[PDB]
Each structure stands twice: as C-alpha cells, then as structure tokens.
Amino acid sequence: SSARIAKAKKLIYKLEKLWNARDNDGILKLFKDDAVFNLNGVPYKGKEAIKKVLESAPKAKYKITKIDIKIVGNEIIVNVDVLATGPSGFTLKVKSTITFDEDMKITSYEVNLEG
Numbered sequence: 001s002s003a004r005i006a007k008a009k010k011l012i013y014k015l016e017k018l019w020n021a022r023d024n025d026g027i028l029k030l031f032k033d034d035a036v037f038n039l040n041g042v043p044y045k046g047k048e049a050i051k052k053v054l055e056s057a058p059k060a061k062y063k064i065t066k067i068d069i070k071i072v073g074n075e076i077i078v079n080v081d082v083l084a085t086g087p088s089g090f091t092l093k094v095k096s097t098i099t100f101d102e103d104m105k106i107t108s109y110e111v112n113l114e115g
C-alpha cells in the first residue's frame with residue numbers, strides 16, 4: 001500500500017516523459033483496457049478510444065509542478081498540476097487527476113484545461 005504511493009509518484013514522472021516523447025504505445029500500457037480518459041469534460045472509454053486521443057494530442061511539452069497523492073478505498077488518486085507549453089511558447093496551467101488501482105494500472109485519467 002505504501003509502495004503503491006511511491007509507484008504512483010514514479011509513474012507520474014514516467015508519464016511526463018512519455019507524454020513529451022509522444023510514446024502513445026507506452027502511455028496506453030499503463031491504462032486499463034477499459035479505462036476512461038476525461039478530456040475536458042468529454043470522456044473517452046476504451047483503449048482504442050484513449051489511443052485515438054493520444055496521437056491527436058497537440059504538439060506540447062509538459063512539466064510537472066505539483067503532485068498530490070490521495071487514497072480513497074483501494075484506489076490511488078493522484079492530482080497533478082502540469083504546465084503545458086505549445087510550440088509558440090503559449091503556456092497553459094492544466095490539471096490532471098489520475099486514478100490507479102491495485103494493479104498500478106490507470107482506471108481514470110482526467111485532464112482539466114480550463115484552469
């Protein structure tokens with residue numbers, strides 16, 4: 001249970017590298033096959049749907065600035081404050097809520113782009 005908190009912290013920084021590397025194949029492997037990707041209010045359920053959003057994600061570099069890990073039941077809730085940089089230098093304070101289960105696989109992944 002304590003290792004799960006540490007595993008979650010490492011998987012967040014791993015996700016940051018995969019996102020900036022556009023390793024969409026690797027990103028999916030941490031996802032449960034029936035996970036939900038809530039992209040600013042629009043949920044995308046299923047590996048095939050989460051995928052299509054990954055390769056359609058805009059060209060952007062991400063830097064983690066704050067990580068909060070909460071435990072609710074048997075699920076690891078990770079709230080990540082991210083700064084997303086576009087090629088034009090446009091910077092947006094985005095927020096992500098990632099949920100892990102016992103298998104350390106992502107069950108829910110919500111990206112908030114409003115602020």
Ligand SMILES: COc1ccc(-n2nc(C(N)=O)c3c2C(=O)N(c2ccc(N4CCCCC4=O)cc2)CC3)cc1
Pocket residue numbers: 012013015016017019039053056057058060062063064080082084085086090091092094095096111113
């Ligand atoms: C320049 O400003 C922007 C604005 C919007 C967008 N934008 N567009 C989409 C889309 N229309 O698909 C998505 C994003 C985004 O910001 N996404 C993301 C959010 C957060 C993370 N990170 C960082 C690593 C660890 C935690 C974590 O969750 C990784 C990717 C994916 C989706 C980009 C740039």
